[PDB]
């Protein structure tokens, strides 16, 4: 019925050793390159991509929807240019959620002028739990997350009315 959009991992203080300013033409807005407002694309800094480790404790007393993604480059040159490694992994866990992702490098038909892909994943973090993000490359970090409050009688309709 409602939710609060809150910043889970503040952009300016959560990643001092990564570049958090990445944009794409495919997400342009008003003529300039941009990116998702709730996600942050982390790339290396000063030639390095230091191992990441971040966590959030759900002190909102609501289920929290956490969104993130994994970048899958078109080639090796791009994988190394951005993450400085050929063997990146992304690992996301909570008390009950556990998933490890591995980037896949492949030539793909272009969609919206891109050959690579970003897969999107999500989970609902229960009140009092902790979500932990560990990675050495290819992570599109959550920036904003939603504290949800459920109601009754609602649904989704498709309409031009």
């Amino acid at each position, epitope marked *: 019925s409602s939710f609060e959009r809150f910043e889970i991992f503040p*952009k*300016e203080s959560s990643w001092p050793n990564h*570049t*958090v*300013t*990445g*944009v*794409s*033409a*495919s997400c342009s807005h*008003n*003529g*300039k*390159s941009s990116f998702y407002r709730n996600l942050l694309w982390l*790339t290396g*800094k*000063n030639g390095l991509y230091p191992n990441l480790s971040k966590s959030y404790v759900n002190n909102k007393e609501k289920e929290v929807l956490v969104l993130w993604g994994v970048h899958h480059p*078109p*080639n090796i*040159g*791009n994988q190394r*240019a*951005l993450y400085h490694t050929e063997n990146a992994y992304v690992s996301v866990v909570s008390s009950h959620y556990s998933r490890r992702f591995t980037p896949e490098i492949a030539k793909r038909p*272009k969609v919206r*002028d*891109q*050959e*690579g892909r970003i897969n999107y994943y999500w989970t609902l973090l229960e009140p009092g739990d902790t979500i932990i993000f560990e990675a050495n490359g290819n992570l599109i970090a959550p920036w904003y997350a939603f504290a949800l409050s459920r109601g009754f009688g609602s649904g989704i309709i498709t309409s031009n009315a």
Partner: antibody
Framework: QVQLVQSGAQLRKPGSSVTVSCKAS????????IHWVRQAPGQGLEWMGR????????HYAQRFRGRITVSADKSTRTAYMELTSLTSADTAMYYC???????????????????????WGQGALVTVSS | QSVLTQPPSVSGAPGQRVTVSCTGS?????????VHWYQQFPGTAPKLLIY???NRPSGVPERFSGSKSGTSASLTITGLQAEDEADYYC????????????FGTGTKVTVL
């Protein structure tokens, strides 16, 4: 090093336009951006705009939008900038510069919106007077 | 454009340590962009001195080192030499007005 090569000094009258070229020599015209920076005599540096020749995309400073056009033609490995409706206040050294913080790939477009001018042209002086 | 504030002049004796400041805002640096520095001598194009706030280009002396904190940045020149007299500029990226690159106002560094 990589050398950007600019046109020489030129004189233009108020109301006319000026075209300043920048050829890529030893560069391997490739997926990198070329930026235009202006410096009036006695002043500091001002960014005017940029082009990425492999995508054909440009971006301009708000002060020049409507007056500045940037284009490139890879067959001669050359970038061009044109500034229209010139006045005496536009007398300046016009420099081209190559970034090193971008390194674009010939697939899709991604930027970190960070960079630096790794290589500079010598500067083309443009004088505007009657 | 000329939005990163720099002192108009910095000075000291040869052999001394001096610094050139660069103050930005939220759109520049405060939006986590880095600071780049250029060294310009009269008659020529500026050349890159520092990039990424702290790194040097090959060929740049150890005398030059920079840093960034908060929304401010600086260039430190330690052990001023006569050849260091120059116009120094800071550069970053400003996210306002649809996005633009910015320069500071410039600093003249004088060896006494």
């Amino acid at each position: 090093q990589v050398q950007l090569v600019q046109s020489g000094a030129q004189l233009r009258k108020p109301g006319s336009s000026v075209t300043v070229s920048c050829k890529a020599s030893g560069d391997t015209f490739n997926s990198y951006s070329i930026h235009w920076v202006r410096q009036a005599p006695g002043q500091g540096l001002e960014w005017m705009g940029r082009i990425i020749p492999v995508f054909g995309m440009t971006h301009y400073a708000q002060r020049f939008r409507g007056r500045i056009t940037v284009s490139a033609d890879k067959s001669t490995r050359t970038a061009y900038m044109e500034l229209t409706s010139l006045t005496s206040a536009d007398t300046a050294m016009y420099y081209c510069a190559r970034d090193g913080g971008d390194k674009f790939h010939s697939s899709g477009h991604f930027e970190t919106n960070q960079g630096y001018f790794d290589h500079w042209g010598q500067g083309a002086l443009v004088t505007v007077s009657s | 454009q000329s939005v990163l504030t720099q002192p108009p002049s910095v000075s000291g004796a040869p052999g001394q340590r001096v610094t050139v400041s660069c103050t930005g805002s939220s759109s520049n640096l405060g939006a986590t962009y880095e600071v780049h520095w250029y060294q310009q001598f009269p008659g020529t194009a500026p050349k890159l001195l520092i990039y990424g706030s702290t790194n040097r280009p090959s060929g740049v002396p150890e005398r030059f080192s920079g840093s960034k904190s908060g929304t401010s940045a600086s260039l430190t020149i330690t052990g001023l030499q006569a050849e260091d007299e120059a116009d120094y500029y800071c550069q970053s990226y400003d996210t306002s007005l649809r996005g633009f690159y910015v320069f500071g106002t410039g600093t003249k560094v004088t060896v006494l």
